[PDB]
Structure 1
Amino acid sequence: SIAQARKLVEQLKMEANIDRIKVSKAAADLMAYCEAHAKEDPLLTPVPASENPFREKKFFC
């Protein structure tokens, strides 16, 4: 563990160094992202059954 504690120190040097953002901004963007892509999420916004392979789509290529 002679060396072991030394890289642990300097690894934290790296980790503590990055500049951060507030959670409000973080959460705001996640929330915003979802809302922008909600229309394109088939588990949220169902598509016509005839375009759904797992319900009624008949032609496939």
Structure 2
Amino acid sequence: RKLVEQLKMEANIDRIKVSKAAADLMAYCEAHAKEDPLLTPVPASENPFRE
């Protein structure tokens, strides 16, 4: 009874088409692309592990 009870509570859940989730992930990654040092090599002067 415990197993069916958990699954039944996992069925009545507000899902969305995967396209919307893909769009959200893509948008979020684009929005913070100008602040990711490992993605955009920062100038050596502002990098604490070079000088």
Flag whether TM exceeds 0.5 (same fold).
yes
Q: Distance in 2 between matches of 1:18 and 1:8?
A: 17
Which structure: greater helix fraction? Answer: 2
Q: Distance in 2 between matches of 1:14 and 1:49?
A: 53
SS of 1:39's partner is: helix
TM-score, normalized by length of structure 2? 0.90
How much has 1:36 moved relative to structure 2? 0.4
Could you list the runs of 5+ residues in structure 1 that have no partner in the other structure? 1-5, 57-61
Q: CA RMSD in A?
A: 0.8
How much has 1:27 moved relative to structure 2? 0.3
**Alignment of structure 1 residues 45-60 onto 2, 5 Å:** 45-56=40-51
Large movers: runs of 4+ above 4 Å: none
Could you list the runs of 5+ residues in structure 2 that have no partner in the other structure? none
How much has 1:23 moved relative to structure 2? 0.6
SS of 2:35's partner is: coil
Q: Which has the larger radius of gyration?
A: 1
